């Protein structure tokens, strides 16, 4: 239970941009979505819904 939490809470996910991959006519914004990314402190690690 401890291990599989560390996996879920300390992972790193991907998701698209906005435009980029074939967009719909006259889009105006293109940026990169930033999902989950790794815990960076002993503190953040303490807080893991177990």
């Amino acid at each position: 239970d401890v291990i599989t939490a560390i996996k879920a809470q300390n992972a790193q996910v991907a998701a698209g941009q906005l435009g980029g991959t074939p967009p719909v006519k006259g889009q105006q914004l293109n940026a990169s979505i930033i999902a989950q990314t790794r815990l960076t402190s002993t503190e953040e690690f303490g807080k893991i819904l177990l």
Binding site: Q12, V13, A14, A15, A35
Partner: protein, 51 residues
Amino acid sequence: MPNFFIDRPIFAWVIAIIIMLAGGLAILKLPVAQYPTIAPPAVTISASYPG
């Protein structure tokens, strides 16, 4: 030293033919291009961490 060859202008003409025959055949097998291998070679590592 020369002087030899003056008594022997055939042997001397012969050298001048071979040297000319050798290269010339060379001209029809020598690689052609603009520049020889000039720029330092490079190696490139490509990685990809999608997202």
